[PDB]
């Protein structure tokens, strides 16, 4: 009989049952979406978008609903923290319910098509054999896809008839769902410009409509029909798998590097913002502007939003996790409760010192403090017997500005050292570690997990492309090579052209 | 090695499958609360 | 709720072991001549 790895090949020449199987897969996928949304709603805590946003709580599908305009719950809250906003039916719960009902309907349709597989539509009028006109199917489905793409761009994203899309400022402080106008100039191809998304979907949808009309009306050249085996549905499987792994690589890349479609208020910051000290630079710019305006140090640092400070912290860097460190980021360092304030370290001479920050590569990192010129001034020694830069020797103190510890100074070497150990992580926060029994070990964010999954799946689908394309092009030898294969066809010099008996010498 | 003549084929028809699954699932639904306690 | 931790695996196995027994018997009946 069929080997276990070929059982589903019974569908290759059975279009009705192929449609039934595809309906079952679609039903399962829709049901998964609904179930995942319901689980996330049962677990999500919406009370602090500032220090406990969705991406700290392991939320995977919630950001995707939020990206396209679903932001409210039937329970009365919104992911932006607003109060007294009614989302109508299309709340998170409503979306989950719709996907569940869709799953059930697809299940029933799958049953119908499985039972009534033998439909006249699936038969060639001329021969009575099952047959699908794949080129015209492609034209039809391309026309439909183009219509949907154009409508999505022209009505949903623009807000003409629809909610728009998530947009934010460059530092992810004031994101919200807004209508977006298309950007037709060169900046439309800038991944960080949302107007480019609207323009792309409008223009690509129109192109899809036109090309779908072409593929509906014009038959393939005989040369291409034969070359690509357009009579064999497995060729479609091969090329479609290729397109899908291309797309998976693209989305993995945009998730990892950031774009208009992967906002940091929905998926968390990127590793490159930590690499480049993006948020630290913005924080310092604001502090310096305040100081120049005349504020005191305490006022300048107290003017810094806790949300910005929280972005400036390595525990939110997606490159700090582990493959088997499971769960939300909260399960690691804990549930963030408050900013402790900016820590300024000084030695006995009163010179300000700066803790060297941990790079993403390091699971652990020493504590080293330098002056503004990069000269080492203090550290926490490993071997003590020849220590020269100990906090005790150098009289290191730490004073806090802004946050919970605003205006407090510490001189006890143990306390000062503990704060420096935290300062290697960037801005210092107070965490609730008891609620989740957090273990104090960093975890990655939805940005990281999405990137990992889709890169891995893309690679595997490259293998799938190779396998099914080979099957398509070598179908005639799938069960073995010709028992009568002429030795002359593999002998050297017998034919002028490899494998062409018409070129015999 | 002469075969053993006492061998017999075994059967479970579809109705028996459905009845057994119903019994098992309902017993699980009943006892799960006590297992979780 | 502070439930017995082993309840999950207890329930899962209680369902799966007898169910798979039945499924094995049924499928091998169907495949008979």
């Amino acid at each position: 009989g069929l080997p276990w790895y070929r059982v589903h090949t019974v569908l290759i020449n059975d279009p009705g049952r192929l449609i039934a199987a595809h309906l079952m897969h679609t039903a399962l996928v829709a049901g998964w979406a609904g179930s995942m949304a319901l689980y996330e709603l049962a677990t999500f805590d919406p009370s602090d978008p500032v220090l406990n946003p969705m991406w700290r709580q392991g939320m995977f599908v919630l950001p995707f609903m939020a990206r396209l305009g679903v932001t409210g719950s039937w329970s009365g809250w919104s992911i932006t923290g607003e109060t007294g906003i009614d989302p109508g039916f299309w709340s998170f719960e409503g979306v989950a319910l719709a996907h569940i009902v869709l799953s059930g309907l697809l299940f029933l349709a799958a049953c119908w098509h499985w039972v009534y597989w033998d439909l006249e539509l699936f038969r060639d009028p001329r021969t009575g054999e099952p047959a699908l006109d794949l080129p015209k199917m492609f034209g039809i489905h391309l026309f439909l896809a183009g219509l949907l793409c154009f409508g999505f761009g022209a009505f949903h994203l623009t807000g003409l008839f629809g909610p728009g899309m998530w947009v934010s400022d460059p530092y992810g402080l004031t994101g919200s769902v807004q209508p977006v106008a298309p950007e037709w100039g060169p900046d439309g191809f800038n991944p960080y410009n949302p107007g480019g998304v609207v323009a792309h979907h409008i223009a690509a949808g129109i192109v899809g409509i036109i090309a779908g009309l072409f593929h509906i009306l014009v038959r393939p050249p005989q040369r291409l029909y034969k070359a690509l085996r357009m009579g064999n549905i497995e060729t479609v499987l091969s090329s479609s798998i290729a397109a899908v792994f291309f797309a998976a690589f693209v989305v993995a890349g945009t998730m990892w590097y950031g774009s208009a479609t992967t906002p940091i208020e929905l998926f968390g910051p990127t590793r490159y913002q930590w690499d480049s000290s993006y948020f630290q630079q913005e924080i310092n710019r604001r502090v310096q502007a305040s100081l120049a305006s005349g504020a005191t140090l305490e006022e300048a640092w107290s003017a810094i939003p806790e949300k910005l400070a929280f972005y400036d912290y390595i525990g939110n860097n997606p490159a700090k996790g582990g493959l088997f460190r499971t769960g939300p980021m909260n399960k690691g360092d804990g549930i963030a409760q408050a900013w402790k304030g900016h820590a300024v370290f000084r030695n006995k001479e009163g010179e300000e010192l700066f803790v060297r920050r941990m790079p993403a590569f390091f699971e652990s990192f020493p504590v080293i403090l330098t002056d503004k010129n990069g000269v080492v001034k203090a550290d926490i020694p490993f071997r003590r017997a020849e220590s020269k830069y100990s906090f005790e020797q150098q009289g290191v103190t730490v004073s806090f500005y802004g946050g919970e510890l605003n205006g407090q100074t510490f001189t006890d070497p143990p306390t000062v050292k503990s704060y420096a150990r935290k300062a290697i992580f960037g801005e210092i926060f107070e965490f609730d570690t008891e609620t989740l029994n957090s273990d104090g070990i960093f975890r990655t964010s939805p940005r990281g997990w999405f990137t990992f999954a889709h890169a891995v799946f893309a690679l595997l689908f490259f293998f799938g492309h190779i396998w099914h394309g080979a099957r398509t092009l070598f179908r005639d030898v799938f069960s073995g090579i010709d028992p009568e294969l002429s030795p002359e066809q593999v002998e050297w010099g017998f034919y002028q052209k490899v494998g062409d008996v018409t070129t015999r010498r | 090695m002469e075969p053993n003549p006492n061998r017999q084929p075994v059967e479970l028809n579809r109705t028996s499958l459905y009845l057994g699954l119903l019994l098992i699932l309902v017993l699980a639904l009943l006892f799960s609360s006590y297992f979780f306690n | 709720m502070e439930v017995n931790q082993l309840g999950l695996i207890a329930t899962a196995l209680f369902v799966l072991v007898p169910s798979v027994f039945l499924i094995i018997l049924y499928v091998q009946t169907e495949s008979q001549q």
Partner: peptide, 30 residues
């Protein structure tokens, strides 16, 4: 986990209903 378990068992039972009704072995007169 417990809520998931209860609901999972219930959904399995409902699916069983569906199959036992619409995919039964048909009665056939002799």
């Amino acid at each position: 986990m417990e809520t998931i378990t209860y609901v999972f068992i219930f959904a399995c039972i409902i699916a069983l209903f569906f199959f036992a009704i619409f995919f039964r072995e048909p009665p056939r007169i002799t």
